[PDB]
Each structure stands twice: as structure tokens, then as C-alpha cells.
């Protein structure tokens, strides 16, 4: 199996994209750390992964306590003696306050900007020395299709994720000599709790209509890209901006009227 | 496994990237047609794929006989009743005549332009209806990193492969409703006959100095991307321009100077 | 007068963008050759330009007679002793035969591909040695927003214009040392004969709904960019892909729905 | 009649370099230019010089370290002149001692730089927009850097933050197009100003120059000329552009300096 003997860390992995990513890595033989705030929920995912024949473990991560970005990484390295894979999946925004430039909350914009960007910067920074020691690694950053598709709202989300794509590419260039790769996966609309709970039915219905492949995404879709980038199957690939959004915003905005679902 | 029950076609697949891609697909259970100009050589590859537990077959294709792009597709569709996957791998240039704008041959430029672009247009056009009939398909076009990195020579190669990238995305948009996906894989310097026999040691040594991940690629690196795009593992991904070039041209041209290999 | 003493050639310049580009360059003191197929119409424009206080001349050009791309450049250099500016404005498609991949006419796809691409390659190739001689020049290629926005019809147009974008950037890299710059201007919907007579009222109204700046473009909008790139105001600018389409396809395809006109 | 007769512009950090050159170009075309600057003494010298060149400029206090001045400087201009038409956001920088790669760079300073640079667009754009809406439109021109689209091996906070400004530019562009407010980014390469000359070594600057195809160091006027285009109605149908002014730096293959010394 592809990741036999490798150690991976996935943040925010007790549900949705994070959990699917952890499951996919564990199926291919990685020892997967669920870096998550809830040990009780993590233990359920772990038992489920073990049932499928894989090994996963828990390490505490809370985005509200930024120190845990580094401590999570150091705990894993101490316990396993190596770190091979890091998947940075934490991210979000405040739909109540993250609007357009003028209507959005100024302070919250900069809170969101730092919160998302640091969720890549801090753990990547801590993990790199351990990855260097074992002769390489892969860092996979979950961005969003909004990072390359300017919008009319959620400006802090869009800009901060675009910043993550940039940071991905700079990290990739800076540690290529150490065989450390860095790539970004940009999901579109995926049928997780986050989208279903924060975006109204009419928003998601409108959005779906502009998705050429004509369905809502699954967490597995994202996980499968994460697996590609995590493994040596993408060993010659670094700095990629990888779109997993059913072709959303690929072409003309006339698409939905001329190709109606 | 991931491609059990599927029928694939790979053009120019008796060696190098084409062969490796055919091998990777067959290993995952696809029935792979080697669309190639030499039946004798195809029979060798077929015998080896069979040794490995896979099934491959031969269909006649020569880029010099443009009719064969369509006939090979019709032959496969008739023989197997379906086509699921098309990998368009044929491509190239004339190093004697394809130079910069002014020094390169005018007529050859346009010959190359049509030669490369039709190698995607013609077989994709014939394949589509067969793909529609089985509820979808995947078309993977082998471009080159040169398609997004302007150069000081091989202008026809660069321009024609850029055209392919555009063609890839238009096809992707146009057949997404039929669950037909189209993605491009752009190799950098790969250790095949084409690069090793047409480019000098000194050119390839220079090129390698600017490759962040600091090695020549393998046909397997490309085949691994083809596999991703050919399978349902990339079912929500279409219109991608996928760079497999070791990070070549990702960032500053000062790179080799400050990070000397 | 920014262009005093300079010699410019604008193809297909008896109406629309070509004309407006010729007029703008002439107003800034350039001697402007109308490379056109109708001498009679060209003489009307020259007259109008003369009344405005500028100088323009005629040189025969017809895209159906490809030798004229070269002959018209040599005539101009012979008559004036120099060439400074080249605006490649010719281009188009056949709306009856240029559809999607499968419904479009195969042979006409490759005719349009050559026709459009050669409308840049041939005259630029001819002009470069003359620009070299006077210590530099500017080549401005008229592309289209369609070159960076995949569509569901006019596939030959989209791909061929994308090819021109790549050709532009390769030329730019290749002749920078000679101070010969090359940039591309990409118009959106412009109120000229070509759009009004070839596209339906329904199509053009739909398109306009997706233009954030909420008006149809004018030939003058494109001429103004052409002037920028033609002069030393852009002396440190080469290889640009310059969008003049009122924001069309800048951002989310939900735009029209939430921000309707 | 001058192009910007009766318009009011604001240029931040405009007592020298790019900012001064931009102010000068706008004033030369008839705009009333406010120098939003930290030193009234120096601003008065620039004002006197602009006056001699035949233009009109004024002072308004702005210091990046006093973030409330982003807003008060805007309000002051609107109160004094009853309108705002043009905003040029030119303040930006980094700390070369602390802004290194991911691992060697200072964590806290990375996020300080990120907020400093991004807020230098966010805050004053947000304050100016309502005034621009009131006069029927406006143009916001953000001074980025070529580094925003060219990943590097140092100055990661500078690269990432400026990339974020590009994204912010495009979201602003989309969001206020319906108010005829345009937003575009100009990306300077190596310009002969105090900041590049004092903070970068001769060795770095010389190496950089070897990779500039147009083969000279840029001038402040080159940036100013682009600013003038975007600020004026000559670009009235242009919004969301990322405009490169770097003599072709990083346009193409990193082998360029080798083969085109
Ligand atoms: N829903 C979508 O359409 C979608 C699609 C693609 C990507 N994304 C992005 O991908 C990522 C995954 O989101 P998702 O869609 O999969 O949503 P999800 O199903 O609700 O999962 C959210 C995960 O994030 C964890 N989390 C939330 N706050 C946390 C905090 N302070 N500290 C540590 N962990 C925290 C949650 O832990 P608990 O289980 O304890 O709550 C949970 O595991 C996000 O970055 C998002 O930007 C969203
Ligand atoms: N090597 C690289 O660095 C690299 C990088 C990027 C992209 N690519 C692209 O990958 C593709 C394959 O290149 P490669 O490196 O794998 O070269 P390769 O190992 O030399 O293989 C070339 C293949 O193309 C076949 N071929 C040549 N002319 C043909 C014709 N008229 N009709 C049918 N088949 C023909 C050959 O058939 P025979 O066996 O009978 O000779 C052979 O199978 C090309 O599109 C190339 O542009 C290569
Ligand atoms: N309409 C649009 O929305 C639009 C907008 C921007 C760019 N474009 C592109 O910009 C360019 C000009 O388009 P336009 O809109 O300005 O069209 P236009 O106003 O209709 O004028 C088209 C020009 O092309 C000339 N022409 C047609 N066939 C020719 C041939 N065989 N040989 C020489 N000249 C020929 C015409 O000459 P005659 O006067 O003799 O007929 C005319 O001068 C094209 O490259 C087009 O792709 C179109
Ligand atoms: N390659 C290059 O040449 C280059 C160099 C630097 C920056 N840039 C980029 O272009 C822009 C301008 O730089 P430049 O080249 O023109 O450098 P410059 O000649 O050194 O000018 C920098 C300007 O910024 C002002 N400034 C510095 N800190 C300030 C603060 N806290 N508050 C208000 N104003 C402040 C300075 O005011 P004082 O006059 O009072 O000192 C000065 O006018 C920046 O956004 C940067 O991204 C390019
Ligand atoms: C609002 C969601 C984040 C939720 C979040 O921050 N978590 C809660 C934590 S907190 O209570 O706010 O602190 C985000 C995560 C994924 C986002 C979506 C995806 O990125 C894909 C889509 C991208 C588009 O640009 C916008 C719609 C689109 C469909 C996004 C809408 C908002 C989503 C659903
Ligand atoms: C010259 C080669 C094609 C050979 C060919 O077409 N043979 C038959 C034509 S003929 O017998 O000479 O007529 C091509 C195949 C792949 C090309 C390379 C790859 O695409 C990757 C690299 C891309 C860069 O832009 C240029 C260098 C780079 C390394 C390319 C140089 C030329 C190569 C090696
Ligand atoms: C159909 C037009 C070509 C006409 C032409 O070449 N005529 C002579 C040839 S023929 O007689 O018909 O053979 C072209 C020229 C400019 C094109 C438009 C512009 O490029 C801008 C737009 C580009 C988009 O991708 C599609 C719509 C969009 C609005 C285009 C539709 C078709 C246009 C209007
Ligand atoms: C270091 C410079 C800013 C200085 C500054 O902020 N000073 C005050 C801060 S502190 O006192 O040092 O903390 C910046 C301004 C412009 C930058 C340059 C330009 O953006 C253009 C170039 C962009 C490339 O990515 C890197 C080199 C390149 C040539 C840059 C080097 C660093 C420069 C010169």
C-alpha cells in the first residue's frame, strides 16, 4: 500500500472533508493523526478507521488556541519519530459578518485573514524540520474554489484563501530541495454540515445550477485529491492549484442558460 | 480495480509516456487499446501487460494518416461496444525547423500547429458519442509544461500545446452535462527517448538546474496523473491544467542561482 | 504628440476596432497605414483622419490572400524606411460552422485556426526586422475575452485566439532584447457590425447581463488600450494579456442572478 | 482640455518614488492631486514642483502606523473638495531583516506585514467608495508587486500579502462595478527607487536585472504611466486587471538569461 509506514496529520478531521481525507490516507496504510478539538468524537472516527483495517490516533488541536498548531506537530513527531504528511483542512468564515468590502466588518475581516492563513503557516512551519529529517514530505492545503473566483460576499474568506494559495506556492518553491512538496486543493460546493448549515437552500440551488458536472460534491472527492498529493504518485508535482468543484467557474457565465440542468 | 470493466484508448503507446500510461490503466483493470503505428511493437507491450495480469489490444493509428484518429475510435467502439477513456498522448515537433518566430519555418509552424491540435480534436470528437452512450467518460490530453512557459525556441510546440490546453477546457465545459471530463497533464523533462535523443546533454543539464525537486521525471510520474484523471477518483474534476514538471518555472528565475543543485 | 515620426500598421481598419485604433494612433502623430481589402473605404477613413489633422495611408491587405500579410509589411517599410507599430486586428470565425466540438465543422475548425493564428504570425514575422533596425517597436494583437473564457460554442474562435495569446507571449520573450514588445488586448462585446450582425439580440442581451460595468463596449475602449501598448507609456510592459470586457467573467457566475440589471 | 480636468485624486506615500511619479502624472493631466503623506514638509516641496510643472497638488496627513489616518485622510479630502474620483494605494513594504522564507522568517512579523499591507488597500478603499458612488464612479489603483505572481525563496510575507492585495482588488472590482467603481492592480518589477537601492544589495539587483528581458531597470514613470491609464476614462471598460510592469520578468523560461545574455 501506497503510504505504508508513513505518518500523517489531518486538522479538523472529525467530520466532512477532514474525516474523509483521514480515512483515505489510512486505507492506504498511513498512521493518521486526527488533529481535532474533540477527543470523544475523534475516538469514534478512530474506531471506524480500525474497523476498515487502518490505524489512526488523536492529537489535540483547537484553532482558538494557536499554540496547538505547533504542539500538535511536536507531539506527533515525539510519539512516532517522524512526520511525512500534513493536511491543513481547518478554515472558515463568519457568514454574518463576512460580506462585501463596505458592509463587512472591518475587524472581523482581519481576524478571518489571520485565522485562515495561520492555519497553514504555523503547522507547516513546525512540520518542515521533521519532514526534512526523513528525506521529504507532502503538505496539502485545503483552500476553496472562491480563492480563484472573486465573489460579491465573503470577501475575507475569498482573500484569505487566495493568500493560502500564494503561501502554498512559496512554500513549495522554498522546500523543494528538501523533497518537501506543497499543493493546494480547492473544493467547490460539497455536501457537508458546513455548507448545509451556513448556506441557505436557495443559495446552494443557485450555485448547483452553475456546476457543469451537475451535482453537489462529496467529501470523498476532496479526499481522493488529497491522497494523490499526499502520496508519491504525485512525487514530481508541487505548487499545484487543484480545482475540485465540478467545473464551477471554468467558463462562460452564460453556461447555465444555454446548458440548463 | 478502479477501472474494472472500462475500455481505454492510449495513442502513441508503444514506449515512454504512452506506454507507462497504458500500463498504469491496465494494472487498474481497464481493457487498454494501444493505438499505435507498429503492430509488432504493440504486440510486445501487450504480451508484457498480459504477464502482469492485464488485458491490452492493438488498433492501428498513425498521425500521418489523419483518418486513423477516427477509424481507430470506431474500431474500438465496434469491438468492445463502449469507450470510457481516451488518453491523447501523440505530440511533438521538428527541432530542425521549429525555432523562434523569425528563424523557424513558416509552413512547418502551421503543420505542427494542425498536427498537434488535431491529435486531440479528431479522436475526442469521435469518442464523445460512445462515451455519452455509457453515461460518461474521461479524456486526458498530454500537453507539456512549455504550454504555460513561453520559450526562446520551439515556438510551434509551445503555441500548439497551449492551443491544446484551451481545447481541453472548451471540451470540458461542452460535455460536462454528459459526464464527460477533459483534463490536461503537462510533463516537464521526462527521461524518455524523445527528450534524451532530441535534446543535448547540456540543454537537459541546464534545464534540470531549474527544476526545484531536483531530478528528471519518469514516464510513471505522468502515467500516475493520467490514472487519477481517468478514474472516478477525479469524478468532480474537469478542465484542469495539471503540471508534472518538478516545479519547473513555478517561481523566480533567480531560483537556480540561490538554490544551487 | 507621443507618436510623432512613428510608422504604424493596423490590419482590417476600415471600421470598428481597427478604424478606432488607426484614428487614435494618427491623432498622436503616427503615420498610420490602413492595411485593408477595400481601397475605396480606406480612402474615406484616410480623408476623415486627414480632416482631424493626422496622416494615414492605404496598403492592400486581404486575409484570404495570405501573401499580402508579408507584401503589405514590405511595401510599408520600403515607402517609409521604417516600421514602429503593428496592430494585428484581423480575426473572426464562421458562426454557422463554428459550434462545439461535435456539431462544429471539422475542416472549418482548422481553417479558422490557421486563418487567425497566421494573421499574427506572418505580419509580425515580417515586421520584426524593420523594428529591430530602428531600435525597437510594439506589436499589439487583438484577441478576445473568449481566449481566456471557455465557451459552449465558437470553439475554433476560442482556441485559435488562445493560441494567439501564447504566440504573443512567446514573441514578447523572443524579441525583448531588441526592444520589440508584444502584448494582447482582449475585447468583450463591442458594439460593432461583427457583433450586431452575427449575434442575435437575445445573445447580446444575455451577454450584457453578465458584464459588471453594465454597458456594451466601444471601439474606442479597445483603441485606448492599443494606444497605451503602442507607445513608450508602456515601454516596460511586454507579454501582457489585457482584458477590456467590462469585467465579464472576472468572478462568480452567480453575479447576474444577485446583481441583475 | 486635459484628461483629468476637474477630477480629484489621492495618492498615498507620494513624497518620493512611484507615489510621487504617479502624483506628478495625474496632476500633469489636470487632476487635483492630494499627497497623502506622513511629512508635510516634504509634501510641500513636491507641491511646489508640481506647481512649476503647471499642476495642482495638496497635502493630507497619512501615516501607515496610525491606521485611523487611512480613513481620516479620505474624509478630509472629501470635505475639502466635495468629491473623490481616484485613489492610488501605493504604500507597501516589508522588513528585509525578518521577512525570509517560511522557517527562517519571523512568525509575528509575517502577520504584522500581512495586515499592514492588506489594510493599506482595504481601509482607504472602504472609506473612499461611498464618495466615489456619489459622483457616479471612480477608479482605485492598487500598487502591488511582480512578486505577487512570482513565488520566491525569501520575503514570503511580502509575496503572500501582495498576492492577497491582487485578490482583494478583484473582489472590490466585482463588488462595485455596478456603481461604476473600477479596481485594478499595477505590479512593479525592479524600479530604480530608494527602497530597492537601499534594501537590496548590488549583487541581488544585478542578478535580477539579468532576468529582465527588456534589459533595464524600471523607472517610477513606467509605473505612473500605467496608473494614469487605469485612473482615467481611457480604461473605462477595464476592471479587475493584474497589470505587470516588470520588463518581462518571469514571463517565460528560467533558461532565458542563459541563452539571451
Ligand atoms: N461544506 C463545504 O462546501 C466545504 C467544501 C469544501 C471545503 N470546505 C473547507 O474545507 C474545510 C472543511 O470544512 P467542512 O466542509 O468539511 O465542514 P464540516 O463537515 O462541518 O467539518 C468541520 C471540521 O472542522 C472542525 N473544527 C471547527 N472548528 C474548529 C476549531 N476551533 N478547532 C479545531 N477544529 C475545528 C470541526 O471539529 P468538530 O467536529 O469538533 O466540530 C470539524 O471536524 C474548511 O476549511 C472549509 O473552508 C468546505
Ligand atoms: N519526454 C518529455 O520530456 C516530454 C515532456 C512533455 C511532454 N511530452 C509529450 O509526451 C508525448 C510522448 O513523448 P515521449 O517522451 O514518451 O516519447 P517516446 O518515448 O519517444 O515515445 C514516442 C511515441 O510516440 C509514437 N509516435 C511517433 N510518431 C508517431 C506517429 N506518426 N504515429 C503514431 N505514433 C507515433 C511513437 O511510436 P513508435 O514506438 O513506433 O516510435 C512512440 O510510441 C508527446 O506528446 C510529448 O510532446 C514529452
Ligand atoms: N464585434 C466584437 O464584439 C469584437 C470586439 C472586439 C474584438 N473583436 C475582434 O477584433 C477584431 C475586429 O472586429 P470588429 O468588431 O471591429 O469588426 P468590424 O467592425 O465588423 O470590422 C471588421 C474588419 O475586418 C475587415 N475584414 C473582414 N474580412 C477581411 C478580409 N478577408 N481581409 C481583410 N480585412 C477583412 C473588414 O473589412 P471591410 O470594411 O472591407 O468589410 C473590417 O474592416 C477581430 O479580430 C475580432 O475577433 C470583435
Ligand atoms: N522595486 C522598487 O523600486 C520598489 C521599491 C519599493 C517599493 N516598491 C513597491 O511600490 C510602492 C512604493 O515604493 P517606492 O519604490 O516608491 O519606494 P520609496 O521611493 O522609498 O518611497 C516609499 C514611500 O513610502 C512612504 N512611507 C514609508 N513609510 C510610510 C508610513 N508609515 N506612512 C506614510 N508613508 C510612508 C515614504 O514617505 P517618506 O518620503 O516620508 O519617507 C515614501 O514616500 C510600494 O507599495 C512597494 O510595494 C517598489
Ligand atoms: C461558511 C462555511 C465555513 C463555516 C465556518 O467557518 N465554520 C464555523 C466556524 S465559526 O462558528 O464561524 O466560528 C464555508 C466553508 C466552505 C464554504 C463554501 C466552499 O468554499 C465552496 C463555495 C465557494 C464559493 O466561493 C462560495 C460558496 C461556497 C459554497 C462556500 C460557502 C461558505 C462555506 C460553506
Ligand atoms: C523534441 C521532442 C519531440 C520529438 C519528436 O517530435 N520527434 C519526431 C519528430 S522528427 O522525427 O524530428 O520529425 C520533444 C518531446 C517533449 C519535449 C520536451 C517536453 O515537452 C518538456 C520540456 C518543455 C519545454 O518547454 C522545452 C524543453 C522540454 C524538455 C521539451 C523539449 C522537446 C521535447 C523533448
Ligand atoms: C462573429 C464575429 C466574427 C464575424 C466574422 O468573422 N465575420 C466574417 C466571417 S464570415 O463571413 O462569417 O465567414 C465575432 C468577432 C468578435 C466576436 C465576439 C467577441 O470576441 C467578444 C465575445 C467573445 C466570447 O467568447 C463570445 C461572444 C463574443 C461577443 C464574440 C461573438 C462573436 C464575435 C462578434
Ligand atoms: C524591501 C522593499 C520595501 C522596504 C520597506 O518596506 N521599508 C520599510 C520597512 S523596514 O524599516 O525595513 O521594516 C521592497 C519594495 C519593493 C520591493 C521589490 C519590488 O517589489 C520588485 C521585486 C519583487 C520581487 O519579488 C523581489 C525583488 C523586488 C526587487 C523587490 C525587493 C524588495 C522591495 C525593494
Numbering used by the authors:
A (entry chain B), B (entry chain C), C (entry chain A): 2 to 262
D (entry chain D): 1 to 261
Quote the passages of the study that discuss this structure, keeping the authors' original sentences.
7α-hydroxysteroid dehydrogenases (7α-HSDH) is responsible for reversibly catalysing the oxidation of C7 α-oriented hydroxyl of the steroid nucleus in the bile acid metabolism and has been detected in numerous genera of bacteria and in mammal. To date, three-dimensional structures of two 7α-HSDHs from Escherichia coli and Brucella Melitensis have been determined, and the characteristics of folding pattern in both the two 7α-HSDHs indicate that they belong to the short-chain dehydrogenases/reductases (SDRs), whose members are dimeric or tetrameric and generally share low sequence identity possessing a single-domain globular Rossmann-related fold. As one of the SDRs, with the similar structure to the two 7α-HSDHs above, CA 7α-HSDH possesses the typical Rossmann-fold that each monomer consists of seven parallel β-strands as a core (β-sheet core) and α-helices located between β-strands at the surface of the globular molecules. Nevertheless, differing from EC 7α-HSDH, CA 7α-HSDH is NADP(H)-dependent and has a more complex C-terminal structure.
To unravel the NADP(H) recognition in 7α-HSDH, we determined the crystal structure of CA 7α-HSDH complexed with NADP+ and taurochenodeoxycholic acid (TCDCA) at resolution 2.0 Å. The three-dimensional structure of CA 7α-HSDH complexed with NADP+ and TCDCA belonged to the P212121 space group and was determined at resolution of 2.0 Å by the molecular displacement method and refined to crystallographic R-factor of 0.182 (Rfree = 0.222). An asymmetric unit of CA 7α-HSDH crystal structure includes four subunits. However, CA 7α-HSDH possesses the active site, Thr145-Tyr158-Lys162, rather than Ser-Tyr-Lys triad. The residue Thr145 forms hydrogen bond with C7-OH of TCDCA while the residue Lys162 forms hydrogen bonds with 2′- and 3′-hydroxyl group of the nicotinamide ribose moiety in NADP+. The phenolic hydroxyl of Tyr158 form hydrogen bonds with C7-OH of TCDCA and 2′-hydroxyl group of the nicotinamide ribose of NADP+. Thr15, Arg16, Arg38 and Arg194 formed a positive charge-rich environment surrounding the 2′-phosphate of adenine ribose and these residues determined the cofactor specificity in CA 7α-HSDH. Furthermore, the amino groups in Arg16, Arg38 and Arg194 form strong hydrogen bonds with the oxygen atoms in the 2′-phosphate of adenine ribose of NADP+. Significantly, we captured an active state of the coenzyme NADP+ with the rather weak electron density of the nicotinamide moiety, which confirmed that nicotinamide moiety of NADP+ act as electron carrier in the dehydrogenation reaction.
